[PDB]
Amino acid sequence: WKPQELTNLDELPYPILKIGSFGRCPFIGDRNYDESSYKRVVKRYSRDKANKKYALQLRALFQYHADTLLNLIFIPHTCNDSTKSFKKWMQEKAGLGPTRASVMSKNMKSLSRLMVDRNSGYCENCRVKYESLEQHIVSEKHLSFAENDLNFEAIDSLIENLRFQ
Amino acid sequence: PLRIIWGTNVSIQECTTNFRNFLMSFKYKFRKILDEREEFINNTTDEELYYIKQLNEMRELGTSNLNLDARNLLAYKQTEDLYHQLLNYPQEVISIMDQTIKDCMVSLIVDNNLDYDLDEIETKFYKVRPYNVGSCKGMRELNPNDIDKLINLKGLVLRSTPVIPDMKVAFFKCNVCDHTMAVEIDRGVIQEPARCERIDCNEPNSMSLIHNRCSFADKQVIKLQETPDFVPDGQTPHSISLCVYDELVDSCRAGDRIEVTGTFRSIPIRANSRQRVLKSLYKTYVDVVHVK
Amino acid sequence: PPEIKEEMIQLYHDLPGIENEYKLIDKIGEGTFSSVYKAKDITGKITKKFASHFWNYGSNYVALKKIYVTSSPQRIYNELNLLYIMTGSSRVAPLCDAKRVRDQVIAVLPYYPHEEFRTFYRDLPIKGIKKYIWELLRALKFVHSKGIIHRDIKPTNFLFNLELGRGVLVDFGLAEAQMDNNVNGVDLTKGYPKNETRRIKRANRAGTRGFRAPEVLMKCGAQSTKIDIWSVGVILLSLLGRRFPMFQSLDDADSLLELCTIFGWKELRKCAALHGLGFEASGLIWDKPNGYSNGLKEFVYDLLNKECTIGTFPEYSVAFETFGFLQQELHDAYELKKYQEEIWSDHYWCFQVLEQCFEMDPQKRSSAEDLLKTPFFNELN
Ligand SMILES: Nc1ncnc2c1ncn2[C@@H]1O[C@H](COP(=O)(O)OP(=O)(O)OP(O)(O)=S)[C@@H](O)[C@H]1O
Ligand SMILES: [Zn+2]
Ligand SMILES: [Zn+2]
């Protein structure tokens, strides 16, 4: 990378470990929004209210045995919580793709300098890209491939075997 | 969004995908329907994948050339735009076609798991020869807006110049330390080094060109007497000059009636040998792509 | 069913015999190369033959896997052949029947009820992790003895039911089986040629993003069985780390740098040395210049520290025992003390077994059978 590309401390081409919060991936992080805001705390607390009842059976099933061989004890923690922060805020308030050649041509690389500006997928049976799947279904090569049965012969044998198992 | 080469309307990705789909999914019955020939369609030949088997036998024989009919591009629906892009911009669209032919040669043994090695195929430089590009309009009915377009011509060969070496790589040697460099040609211009490339030897004007170590390519000039289908009132026949390169050298003999498809080119000609002054009126010639 | 009912009726026109053979209820899962539906068993011998594969939940629903026609028939035959050869244990989900029409094929499997994984990891306890990892390692060592490499182990592929506490594996569609100096000048170790003529090695790159093994990242010609065990290690680290999409790769080299920022430039150069290729990184400012020499403890430590001190983490002490645990390692009621010593012991053990679960060299990396005989998994035996 040229130094002009990497100048930004926020967007970097290579991944950096900025961690983040709220179950998000550590490399992207939380650039779009912060969890320290009051409103975000309110929505997270509202989801937490829903999650208490769901988490109670989760704690109770595996408290002593991994298997179902079976009221709950929980470790106190010095570090802070979402509810204490909420309380503090209230106190403040109150595609497979096609394979391609390894090496490219010199004329092909020369054309990259001349370029300016002005559902979809790949079918391996016909080995072509399509704009839409429903248009690829109605095409002479796909329908000609469908009416032929000599290329599913192995399938056919397997079908027959799986019929009398 | 989508990128377009400046001066054209051509996208490398779009043309590559369209020509790849065309090569994977063409049948000669499409050419039968396009030419309004329904009663001549037969099951055993037309319904077979044309370019698939042609590329297969291209792999078995060691052939590195694909002869492409431009009318077949009009036969296929998705390449009807590409046909025009082949006629208007041969220089880059032909390169796109060569690159995707190489991709298809890789794909036919990657997907089907053949015993051929990939090294020999990816070492080879596959190139395409489009032909039957349209109506055979005359040389003298063409215009300066037709420069760098694909043109098809009738003719009789009158004579050909001997094999001419045109210089592709240049070999320069230092006089004092015998350090050499090789420089590639870039659009007809070779950059001779002012200073020696060595860190120890940096003597000025110490690099001399050794003409026999540098690599050359074949270039031949053929004088072709054109026989147009339509001749205007009182038009007297003329001779064109057509330049063939590399493999096409010495493929046309004097006195044969041939079908030349090539690129309409124009260059300025120097008025004097000693001076670099060029003439404002340009000299036209055909850069030959395919000979039938 | 706002719009999917037209897809059910469309599938009904797709196959003429499915009406007499099945009745289909809903759409359960959407994938990349298939879309699976839940259907009623109605009448059939397949339900009576297998029986035991269906759970104790009952009612005998049957999954119906519709495969897109874009997939190559060779991969389909490979997938169905691999499912039919294996059979045996319940975790592999053997197929009942196959229904084929002129272009499309239907795979019929017993339905295994479960819930989505985005609900597990945030609140699932360490004993649940023990059962989860135990089920995956039993199923993986089973498919190892059969000789099948899966290369597609993801949380969506694994099906787990909480109230019964068991698992099952699907998606063997990308699986397969395997059977087996100095020259002067041209110092290529400092730069690449402007025009490339040599080829790129044709790998078997087919995994999902963020789970692809580091051997797969470097395109090893002789590919082993041990992609799956590193992937189950990755799932283990995501469960312990409380972060779901922990590895996300824009491309391959992005994933190489993702491995670099945790393990270190030197560690991956030694891992690269055994594979025959050398990796150099110049510049590349980050936090830990040589990675973490201690291991994964301090990395997952400040990983939880950031999201804890921010304070968006949920209130459940199911994932607070790890913060206290890791805090006393980095710093350094009697029944409460019993719960202490038990959780402390096996929770140290899971990180301990995690470092051997994350070994770079496959030959040094122990097989799943050795993972079963570790002292960490004692109570399940
Ligand atoms: N028997 C089953 N019971 C319940 N859910 C299932 C079952 N089989 C598949 N699924 C669901 O289907 C999804 C997994 O489908 P996949 O097999 O991964 O599809 P796919 O991976 O896109 O196609 P492949 O890789 O070529 S098999 C998950 O959402 C699973 O929950
Ligand atoms: Zn198709
Ligand atoms: Zn010199």
The rounded Cα C63 to chain-centroid distance in angstroms is 21
| Closest-CA distance of chain C to residue B26, Å | 19
Q: Which of B53, B64, B44 is nearest to B23 (CA)?
A: B53
d(CA A155, CA B182): 58
Residues with CB under 6 A from ligand 1: C 28-29, 31-34, 36, 63, 93, 109, 111-112, 152, 156-157, 159, 170-171, 173-174
Residue with CA nearest ligand 1 atom 14? C157
Amino acid at C112: Y
Q: Is-contact C347 C323, C-beta < 8 A? A: no
Residues 6 or more apart in contact with residue A107 via CB below 8 angstroms? B92, B95
C131 is in an annotated binding site: no
Q: Which of B199, B211, B208, B291 is nearest to B252 (CA)?
A: B291
Residues 6 or more apart in contact with residue C214 via CB below 8 angstroms? C230, C259, C268, C271, C360
State in Å: Cα A120 to ligand 2 middle.
13
Interface test with B, best of C199, C200, C202 (most B CBs within 10 A): C199
Binding residues of A: 123, 126, 136, 142
State in Å: Cα A60 to ligand 1 middle.
29
C28 is in an annotated binding site: yes
State in Å: Cα C158 to ligand 1 middle.
9
Residues 6 or more apart in contact with residue A51 via CB below 8 angstroms? C123, C314, C316
Q: What is the 3 state secondary structure string of chain C?
A: CCCHHHHHHHHHHHCCCHHHHCEEEEEEEECCCEEEEEEECCCCHHHHHHHHHCCCCCCCCEEEEEECCCCCHHHHHHHHHHHHHHCCCHHHCCCCEEEECCCCEEEEEECCCCCCCCCCCCCCCHHHHHHHHHHHHHHHHHHHHCCEECCCCCCCCEEEECCCCEEEECCCCCCEECCCCCCCCCCHHHCCCCCCCCCCCCCCCCCCCCCCCHHHHCCCCCCCCCHHHHHHHHHHHHHHHCCCCCCCCCCHHHHHHHHHHHHCHHHHHHHHHHHCCCCCCCCCCCCCECECCCCHHHHHHHHHHHHHHHCCCCCCCCCCHHHHHHHHHHHCCHHHHHHHHHHHHHHHHHHHHHHHHCCCCCCCCCCHHHHHCCHHHCCCC
C189 is in an annotated binding site: no
Burial class for A87, CB neighbours closer than 10 Å (0-12, 13-18, 19+): exposed
Is C152 annotated as catalytic?
Answer: yes
C31 is in an annotated binding site: yes
Q: Taking the C-alpha atoms of C68, C71, C74 and C79 in order, what is their torsion angle to the nearest 10 degrees?
A: -60
The rounded Cα C326 to chain-centroid distance in angstroms is 25
State in Å: Cα B212 to ligand 3 middle.
20
d(CA B165, CA B256): 25
Amino acid at A124: E
Residue from the list B12, B107, B122 with its beta carbon closest to the beta carbon of A98: B107
Give the resolution in Å: 2.9
Residue B274 token pair: 């000693």
Q: Are strands C62-67 and C23-30 parallel, antiparallel or unpaired?
A: unpaired
Find the angle CA(C88)-CA(C93)-CA(C95) to the nearest 5 degrees: 90
Experimental method: cryo-EM
**How far from each other are the two terminal CA atoms of chain C, in whole angstroms?**
45
Chains A–C, number of C-beta pairs less than 8 Å apart: 201
- Centre a 10 Å sphere on the Cβ of residue B71 and count the other Cβ atoms it contains: 15
C36 is in an annotated binding site: yes
d(CA A115, CA A112): 6
The reply to whether A65 touches chain C by the CB within 8 Å rule is: yes
Residues 6 or more apart in contact with residue A35 via CB below 8 angstroms? A21, A22, A41, A44, C310, C311, C312
What is the length of chain A? 165
Q: Is-contact B262 B150, C-beta < 8 A? A: yes
The reply to whether A131 touches chain C by the CB within 8 Å rule is: no
Between chains, do B110 and C197 touch, taking CB under 8 Å as contact?
A: no
Residue A114 token pair: 């001349």
Give the CA count within 13 Å in the CB-facing half-sphere of C267: 21
Residue from the list C195, C196, C317 with its beta carbon closest to the beta carbon of A74: C317
Interface test with B, best of A96, A104, A108, A148 (most B CBs within 10 A): A108
Between chains, do A48 and C314 touch, taking CB under 8 Å as contact?
A: yes
Residue from the list A51, A63, A149 with its beta carbon closest to the beta carbon of C314: A51
Q: Which of C146, C144, C145, C156 is nearest to C32 (CA)?
A: C156
- All residues of chain B having their beta carbon less than 8 Å from the beta carbon of residue A104 are 99
Residue C170 token pair: 């699907």
Q: Is-contact B212 B202, C-beta < 8 A? A: no
Residues 6 or more apart in contact with residue B165 via CB below 8 angstroms? B216, B217, B218, B219
Rg (CA), chain B: 23
Between chains, do C165 and A67 touch, taking CB under 8 Å as contact?
A: yes
Between chains, do B118 and C197 touch, taking CB under 8 Å as contact?
A: no
d(CA C24, CA C62): 9
State in Å: Cα B30 to ligand 1 middle.
41
Residue C41 token pair: 């068993």
Distances (CA, A) of C150 to C169, C228, C275: 10, 6, 22
Q: If you write DSSP's letter for every residue of A30-63 in order, what string do you get?
A: S-S--TTSHHHHHHHHHHHHHHHHHHHHHHHHTS
Subunits adjacent to chain B (3 or more Cβ pairs under 8 Å):
A, C
Q: Is-contact B156 B167, C-beta < 8 A? A: no
Q: Of these residues, C152, C171, C228, C346, which one is catalytic?
A: C152
- All residues of chain B having their beta carbon less than 8 Å from the beta carbon of residue C199 are 118-119, 122
Residue with CA nearest ligand 1 atom 4? C112
| Closest-CA distance of chain B to residue A137, Å | 14
d(CA C211, CA C205): 11
| Closest-CA distance of chain C to residue B184, Å | 12
Q: Which of B6, B8, B2, B10 is nearest to B82 (CA)?
A: B10
Ligand 1 binding pocket mutation candidate from C26, C30, C36 (most atoms within 8 A of CB): C36
Residue with CA nearest ligand 1 atom 15? C31
State in Å: Cα B103 to ligand 2 middle.
19
- All residues of chain B having their beta carbon less than 8 Å from the beta carbon of residue C197 are 123
DSSP secondary-structure letter at B148? Answer: T
Residue C137 token pair: 């390692």
Residue A135 token pair: 């248009």
Q: Are strands B180-184 and B257-267 parallel, antiparallel or unpaired?
A: unpaired
The reply to whether C195 touches chain B by the CB within 8 Å rule is: no
The reply to whether A161 touches chain B by the CB within 8 Å rule is: no
d(CA A63, CA C51): 32
Q: Which ligand is nearest to the CA of A96?
A: 1
Residue with CA nearest ligand 1 atom 17? C171
Helix axis angle, B12-24 to B80-88, nearest 10°:
120
Q: Which ligand is nearest to the CA of A124?
A: 2
DSSP bridge partners of B278? B270
